[PDB]
Amino acid sequence: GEKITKVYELGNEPERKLWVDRYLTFMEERGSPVSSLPAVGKKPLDLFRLYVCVKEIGGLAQVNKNKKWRELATNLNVGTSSSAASSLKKQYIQYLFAFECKIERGEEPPPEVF
């Protein structure tokens, strides 16, 4: 139950502020605004760190192929269990994958027309 503004405060990496500004605006404009920090169990998720760590591996598809969700959950202190790994993957898909597509591959969700 932490306010999303806490994500600006979880660290002061030079690139964090711009990333968060871009991310929250991206989410508000697509109709899925984020108001609270997502969590896995009782752990608030530092979305910026999670995004950066997944990017290091090469994105969602690469983490899936290399089966690195348990390593990520362990290294981010989310948990060492298979369930913590699956919960972390779920939160990445729900909160960050659409953004990954936009930022890493210039993907621009085809205008909702069809």
Helices (H) and strands (E) in the chain, counts: 7, 2
Residue-wise burial string across 44-67, b where 16 or more C-beta atoms lie within 10 A, e elsewhere: bbbbbbbbebbbebebbeebeeee
Dihedrals φ, ψ of 44, to 5°? Answer: -70, 135
Q: C-alpha distances in angstroms, 102 versus 13, 23, 29, 107? A: 22, 10, 13, 4
**Residue matched to tokens 């998720």:** 45
* Sequence ranges of the domains in the chain: 1-114
Q: Which residues pair with 3 in a beta bridge?
A: 36
The label of the residue with tokens 């969590």 reads 39
Q: Report the largest interatomic distance among the alpha carbons of the chain, rounded to a whole angstrom.
A: 43
Task: Give the span between the Cα atoms of 72 and 114, in whole angstroms.
Answer: 37
CB of 76 within 8 A of CB of 38?
no
Looking at domain 1-114, what is its CATH homologous superfamily? Answer: ARID DNA-binding domain (1.10.150.60)
Q: For residue 38, with 0-12 CB atoms within 10 Å meaning exposed, 13-18 middle and 19 or more buried, which class applies?
A: buried
21: Cβ–Cβ under 8 A, 6 or more apart, which residues? none
| SS3 state at 23 | helix
Is the dihedral angle over the CA atoms 75, 76, 77, 80 positive or is it negative?
negative
